[PDB]
Design a protein around this ligand. Structure first.
Ligand SMILES: CN1C(=O)[C@@H](CC2CCCC2)N(C2CCCC2)c2nc(Nc3cc(Cl)c(O)c(Cl)c3)ncc21
Lengths: 300, 307
């Protein structure tokens, strides 16, 4: 029984909007392939209830969903279940998170830290449409394995004649390990991690070049295990259907897809998280090349 | 899993989509302990403007409005209809055209499973309903859902291709399985001799139901309603419909549940031939004496018809 119980009313509208459009999609069948007209598509919905269901939702609001068919397919390709994405958005009010880039304004996270909700400009929205078909293709050929943002949906909400644009992505950071430090650059890991990380980075940057984009940056979160233990102990005494277990330096790489463990032969044990950040808002191929040079040598 | 709202007419696709939409929405709103006065002036409204999305059965652009979602939701449960079951009858497969009748020969739909009746109505009928709803609701509580009156279940306004339709949803007076051979619409003062013979509990139960119903229509200042009588003939159905269900299920392309067919009555255990009867008060809206006398005139005549 989903009261879209939230702090801001715009947040309630987001929850209701995601719930509706996801339910709505469950009655559309999955095509063999997407069509050119799926990249020009949307669904708009105007709600004007009166003296009904006003307890949490505004009585009047609009919710537009850009290219629903495309983002369903991206979700599939990032391995995100539509019922799962719907539950993270709707079981509980999304919550204010810190920051993951200079991108837009308000930063939010689903109550279970799985997905990141950014508020974006209208100009950002346009750039997304510009790039969406070549992005989609890029995700197809890399089997959804990128350091690029992993776009999951894109929405326009209107409450009280104000339009807000939101973009939903996969969290760069663990939805369960806290990030103690972040770095935004415009470090010793396993040789497998290192080889794989450089492989993604080479393609991701090259695609960003062929799409004539510069000025994106690498975001780096660092989780300190020893610290997480000390801070576990510190709040201890002051107090997955069942709870998943996990050891100390530990995560699920199907879930926390940007995460790397620090090499075993290395002092204090740590989880890193590195993503390419701010794809929206030297020539680009030159910037590509210099970006490849730099973030390469951060790692051993 | 999967509701592609396919139907002959877009208006019907839209009805199916909207019933699905509104019943879902309601599942996320708690059943209050009592309806407030403001629930009776309440509505849900929704405008869909899809573009190059979800276009195969549904129109790109349409509007759907539900009058009094809480009230009707309540009535539905007072009538022992599960919202879940109600959604299925409308959404599983398209509602269909009817066997059909009226006074100007009215055109109505049935849910694919013949369990519910949908009837296009006028702007003025919607208003009539609103005028009577609060009292209608009060009445439904006081007899615990036991009436011959239309069991009203939903009230909608669809708009497609710039045209607004009003529709009302009701329990079917007739069985969803047994065929009705004979229809009669007793419009006040085919029987006047042809008597109708039923069990004692059935006969006393019918009479007291009738008695409060007409009283209720009187204490609302309503007249010109009629008694809709359907007869299903058991022997005839055995003759005509012997190998029909089986031959539907091939190579090429007298009992009932009282819980479902609520207006039904078996013919008396020692009676000419085996029959099932269906009586209800019909035409309560707007599709010389006074209403409190028309009441007496109705209870008199419809009493005399059962022995
Ligand atoms: C309670 N109720 C009615 O009030 C109306 C439809 C109303 C809907 C709101 C105003 C009109 N009616 C009637 C429909 C036209 C007006 C009276 C009904 N017909 C049936 N089932 C039925 C009736 C006939 Cl006559 C029939 O041949 C078949 Cl197959 C099913 N069951 C119930 C009703």
């Amino acid at each position: 029984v989903k009261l879209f119980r939230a702090s801001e009313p715009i947040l309630s509208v987001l929850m209701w909007g995601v719930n509706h459009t996801i339910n709505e999609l469950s009655n559309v069948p999955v095509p063999v392939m997407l069509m050119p007209d799926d990249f020009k598509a949307y669904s708009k919905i105007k709600v004007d209830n009166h003296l009904f269901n006003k307890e949490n939702l505004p009585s009047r609001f609009k919710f537009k969903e850009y290219c629903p068919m495309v983002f369903r397919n991206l979700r599939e390709r990032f391995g995100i279940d539509d019922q799962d994405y719907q539950n993270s958005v709707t079981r509980s009010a999304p919550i204010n998170s810190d920051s993951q880039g200079r991108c837009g304004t308000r930063f939010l996270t689903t109550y279970d830290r799985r997905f990141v909700i950014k508020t974006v400009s209208s100009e950002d929205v346009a750039e997304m449409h510009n790039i969406l078909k070549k992005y989609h293709q890029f995700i197809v050929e890399c089997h959804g394995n990128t350091l690029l943002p992993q776009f999951l949906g894109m929405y326009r909400l209107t409450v009280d004649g104000v339009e807000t644009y939101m973009v939903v992505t996969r969290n760069v950071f663990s939805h369960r390990l806290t990030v103690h430090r972040k770095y935004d650059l415009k470090l010793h890991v396993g040789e497998e991690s290192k080889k794989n990380f450089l492989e993604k980075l080479k393609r991701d940057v090259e695609f960003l070049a062929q799409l004539k984009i510069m000025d994106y940056s690498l975001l780096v979160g660092i989780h300190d295990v020893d610290r997480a233990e000390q801070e576990e102990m510190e709040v201890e005494e002051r107090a997955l259907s069942f709870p998943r277990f996990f050891g100390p330096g530990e995560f699920d790489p199907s879930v926390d897809v940007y995460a790397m463990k620090s090499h075993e032969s290395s002092p204090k044990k740590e989880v890193y998280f590195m993503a390419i950040i701010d794809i929206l808002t030297v020539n680009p191929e030159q910037y590509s090349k210099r970006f490849n040079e730099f973030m390469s040598n951060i790692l051993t």
